[PDB]
Design a protein around this ligand. Structure first.
Ligand SMILES: [Cl-]
Ligand SMILES: [Cl-]
Ligand SMILES: [Cl-]
Ligand SMILES: [Cl-]
Ligand SMILES: [Cl-]
Ligand SMILES: [Cl-]
Ligand SMILES: [Cl-]
Ligand SMILES: [Cl-]
Ligand SMILES: [Cl-]
Ligand SMILES: [Cl-]
Ligand code: NA
Ligand code: NA
Lengths: 294, 294
């Protein structure tokens, strides 16, 4: 059993769609990126604005906080990929290589690399401190909407507008497996924290798969909308956020949809805090909504 | 997904614990039995008292409405088993045979028999119109708390204080299979409407099994209290009612507990109406509580 989630706090300040959200490893603050071209750092406990980081010239599509270093990484529709030093509160590195808009990113848990995914149909692997390109993961035939890393092989998983999922060999920089089941564009991928399974979302279905080869488990059906985000906690609460503002909460193992949250409406990104007691959403109505168990 | 259930109406009138509840085939009214020794007929739409049937000298433990005839059957701790003619609103038949308190009953869907279960460790099969004993189902070593019928073999299923479930051959009047898994007294049995599976409840676990031989499927864990009742609808909503007043709602197939309803507290019996839109509970606080989807 998972207790229901209820709206606790609504955080405003952005002047356009909030496209991305991430929580720092120490759980003290969270970061958001927006269509207004800004990155904002908010205090988690209070919901107050700490800092506003400027530099992007188009929508900020991805934000992530480093565990290894006091860094924050961001990416945008302006093709820019930046490393922000959180001790100096300024950009220290630019990762050049994407041919068009950068849609998302992830950090590798064991290798000091940043992985970005783009409208250019690639995912790119960058050495954090030297900015050097490690590999350009080419194989998708359309925009790569989502990318996730893990320590175990396959180390990189991508979801694409080509309606496929690719499982990559990080060392060789090659596709190990291509999963074609989704009938429509894949915009979200989530890895279960126990490392045995993962899920992907498209309007036709949310699909659950087994590592390492991507054996299909089951469909999580009922969220008949454009799925923008998928996030899961250690307790097994899977959250699917849709472009029409709807949010479905599921039990990971059973695939059962336990809660349906009602809603320019839309949910672009979801994240749990480090304690997993708070669910933070980034929405089209220019706000961040905070949910807690009740 | 199953929408949550919320309290819609509270029906009072009984002067003691409400031990049993049943809905008529035409869905116009429902019947309850109580520790105050009365049987009450209430209008379903309004919740108003229609008739009060008197005759039992101890707690009424079971009530059921016939589909074949305009009859209502009742049983009690006074060892009495009665057939009430609903056209005349009076007792027309007494079924004699139980050696002690009668705990429950059920009607067979194809054979014109009434089945009762008792403190005497038996379940008894009675021909409705002649009152003749068809079979005395002996095999349990303690009180038989619950009994259910079905057209397919095994036609009769009993749950006992001996911690076992017995699957019976109605024709021979013999046990086909004895299920011993429960560590504690079994007080509730429910048959899934599709006829492939069934469930049983004890404080240690709610267990789900396959027909015809009772192959164990899974445990529905988390309702750590004395389970008095189990009821399921065609949509897959399983309701478990406890002696401490707690009610857990589950998805039948997955076994996932989706809702936990808070509470002399106690739930003795649960029943869905014919439309399955209403959940009616019979409680220790002397009331009938009506729940609807919200
Ligand atoms: Cl640079
Ligand atoms: Cl990992
Ligand atoms: Cl596999
Ligand atoms: Cl499936
Ligand atoms: Cl809901
Ligand atoms: Cl008689
Ligand atoms: Cl049947
Ligand atoms: Cl079986
Ligand atoms: Cl189990
Ligand atoms: Cl609940
Ligand atoms: Na993104
Ligand atoms: Na009963």
């Amino acid at each position: 059993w998972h207790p229901p989630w209820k709206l606790y706090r609504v955080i405003s300040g952005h002047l356009g769609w909030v496209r991305c959200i991430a929580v720092e490893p120490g759980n003290q603050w969270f970061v958001t990126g927006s269509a207004d071209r800004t990155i904002k750092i908010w205090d988690l406990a209070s919901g107050k604005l700490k800092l506003s980081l400027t530099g992007h010239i188009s929508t900020v599509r991805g934000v992530i906080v480093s565990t290894r270093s006091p860094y924050l990484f961001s990416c945008g529709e302006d093709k820019q990929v930046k490393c922000w030093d959180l001790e100096y509160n300024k950009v220290i590195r630019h990762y050049h290589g994407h041919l068009s808009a950068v849609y998302g990113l992830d950090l590798h848990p064991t290798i000091d690399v940043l992985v970005t995914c783009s409208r250019d149909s690639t995912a790119r692997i960058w050495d954090v401190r030297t900015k050097a390109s490690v590999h350009t993961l080419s194989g998708h035939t359309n925009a790569v909407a989502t990318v996730r890393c893990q320590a175990a092989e396959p180390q990189i998983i991508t979801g694409s507008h080509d309606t496929t999922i690719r499982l990559w060999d990080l060392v060789a920089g090659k596709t190990r497996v291509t999963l074609t089941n989704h009938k429509k564009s894949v915009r979200a991928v989530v890895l279960h924290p126990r490392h045995y399974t993962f899920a992907s979302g498209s309007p036709d279905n949310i699909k659950q798969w087994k590592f390492p080869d991507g054996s299909f488990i089951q469909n999580l059906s009922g969220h008949n909308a454009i799925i923008n985000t998928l996030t899961v906690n250690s307790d097994g609460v899977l959250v699917s956020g849709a472009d029409n503002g709807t949010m479905h909460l599921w039990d990971w193992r059973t695939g059962y949809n336990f809660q349906r949250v009602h809603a320019e409406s839309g949910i672009f990104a979801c994240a749990f805090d480090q304690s997993e007691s708070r669910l933070l959403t980034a929405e089209a109505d220019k706000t961040i909504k905070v949910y807690r168990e009740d």
